[PDB]
Amino acid sequence: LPALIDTQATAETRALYRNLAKLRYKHLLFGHEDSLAYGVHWEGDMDRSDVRDVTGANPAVYGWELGGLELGHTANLDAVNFEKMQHWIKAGYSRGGVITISWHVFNPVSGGNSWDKTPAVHELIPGGARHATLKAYLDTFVAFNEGLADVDAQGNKHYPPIIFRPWHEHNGDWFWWGKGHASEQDYIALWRFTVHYLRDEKKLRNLIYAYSPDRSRIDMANFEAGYLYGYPGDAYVDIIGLDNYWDVGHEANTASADEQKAALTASLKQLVQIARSKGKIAALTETGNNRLTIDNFWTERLLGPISADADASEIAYVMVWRNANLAREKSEQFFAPFPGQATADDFKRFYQSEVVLFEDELPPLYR
Numbered sequence: 001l002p003a004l005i006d007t008q009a010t011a012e013t014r015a016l017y018r019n020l021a022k023l024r025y026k027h028l029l030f031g032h033e034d035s036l037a038y039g040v041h042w043e044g045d046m047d048r049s050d051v052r053d054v055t056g057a058n059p060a061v062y063g064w065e066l067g068g069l070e071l072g073h074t075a076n077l078d079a080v081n082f083e084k085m086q087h088w089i090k091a092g093y094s095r096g097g098v099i100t101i102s103w104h105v106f107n108p109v110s111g112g113n114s115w116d117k118t119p120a121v122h123e124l125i126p127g128g129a130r131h132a133t134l135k136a137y138l139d140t141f142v143a144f145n146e147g148l149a150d151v152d153a154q155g156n157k158h159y160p161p162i163i164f165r166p167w168h169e170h171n172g173d174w175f176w177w178g179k180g181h182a183s184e185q186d187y188i189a190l191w192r193f194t195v196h197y198l199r200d201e202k203k204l205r206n207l208i209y210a211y212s213p214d215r216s217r218i219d220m221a222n223f224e225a226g227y228l229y230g231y232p233g234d235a236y237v238d239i240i241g242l243d244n245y246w247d248v249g250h251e252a253n254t255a256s257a258d259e260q261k262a263a264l265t266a267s268l269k270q271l272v273q274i275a276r277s278k279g280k281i282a283a284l285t286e287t288g289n290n291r292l293t294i295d296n297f298w299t300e301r302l303l304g305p306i307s308a309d310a311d312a313s314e315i316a317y318v319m320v321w322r323n324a325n326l327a328r329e330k331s332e333q334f335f336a337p338f339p340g341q342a343t344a345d346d347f348k349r350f351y352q353s354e355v356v357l358f359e360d361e362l363p364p365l366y367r
């Protein structure tokens with residue numbers, strides 16, 4: 001029933017969206033960022049995941065990250081090799097998994113990373129002095145996407161569908177495309193150009209576009225207004241996403257656990273209401289508890305509050321962030337368990353839930 005903004009989307013892309021729309025009522029796909037690239041205690045294996053090591057199954061949704069691609073780097077900002085990334089995307093897709101991609105774009109003005117707040121959006125949008133840079137940046141993704149293609153016996157080209165989730169958390173002030181660094185109207189212009197360029201100029205047909213404000217900068221008394229800050233229009237968005245680490249035990253959140261659980265449910269309920277009104281699909285596009293310090297996190301803090309309300313439950317998927325490699329990165333950062341981690345058994349319970357789907361029990365999404 002929801003329809004993609006790309007009226008010419010590939011058969012597989014159309015199928016994915018249709019099937020997510022169907023499965024969302026009774027199920028929730030689980031996702032993990034950089035799941036095949038490395039884990040907390042390993043890197044190098046070409047077919048491994050912390051998630052699989054714990055549960056026996058890969059995540060249903062695989063998140064990947066392009067930051068650095070635009071600069072012609074061999075590897076992304078977390079040292080994930082782009083050729084390997086292409087291999088891993090193809091591998092996950094071949095098994096029936098879902099692919100989603102974010103993009104922590106480097107600051108073109110300074111050469112700094114996404115967290116360098118030097119203003120850039122005004123310069124990047126149509127009419128801006130650096131508009132050529134925006135085109136060049138997007139071109140690198142066009143090229144990357146080509147590296148995901150196969151060609152069948154009949155000479156037809158096929159791609160993995162990708163849930164493309166750019167310019168995220170734009171209601172926060174931490175990225176250079178965020179509030180305080182870009183006007184609302186300029187942000188909208190940036191988004192709209194991104195869609196026009198990829199969908200219309202470059203004729204990519206394998207994208208589903210995901211919009212993802214951060215819950216931590218939305219006033220719960222006025223959720224819709226906060227959510228729709230910088231919203232580019234229904235003609236430019238397929239997935240009504242949300243990044244919400246806040247209500248799942250963020251260290252800076254002084255709300256009680258019970259208040260947080262209620263807020264998680266309320267946030268997702270309202271998200272779903274917005275999606276319903278717009279004929280879209282909702283998803284919890286980023287979440288998690290860094291270092292998994294909360295007892296029974298998965299069942300008590302994530303699944304429980306989602307399942308508590310039938311509106312909240314209508315989200316299609318939930319993705320947790322990456323399991324940074326300790327040896328390489330020098331600190332602990334992870335959002336899925338690994339064997340022996342305190343929440344591993346509770347994660348097994350989460351996996352086991354009839355509601356939650358990992359790769360191993362996905363129906364065929366692409367037909």
Ligand SMILES: OC[C@H]1O[C@H](OC[C@H]2O[C@@H](O[C@H]3[C@H](O)[C@H](O)[C@H](O[C@H]4[C@H](O)[C@H](O)[C@H](O)O[C@@H]4CO)O[C@@H]3CO)[C@@H](O)[C@@H](O)[C@@H]2O[C@@H]2O[C@H](CO)[C@@H](O)[C@H](O)[C@@H]2O)[C@H](O)[C@@H](O)[C@H]1O
Nearest residue numbers: 065077078104169174214216217243245252290321322333
């Ligand atoms: O490196 C550990 C980090 O873990 C957390 O970031 C997780 C993940 O979240 C997404 O963006 C972040 C963003 O970086 C902001 O710092 C923001 O912090 C604000 C809080 O939300 C809240 O509002 C608070 O009141 O104020 C904070 C601002 O001071 O949080 C958002 C949402 O969590 C996500 O897309 C990533 O950017 C980020 O993880 C990084 O991902 C990149 C790219 O893969 C890696 O290079 C990094 O190493 C991280 O993995 C946490 O928010 C951070 O503070 C930090 O501890």
Ligand code: NA
Nearest residue numbers: 024027313315
């Ligand atoms: Na659901």
Ligand code: NA
Nearest residue numbers: 351352353356
């Ligand atoms: Na399950």
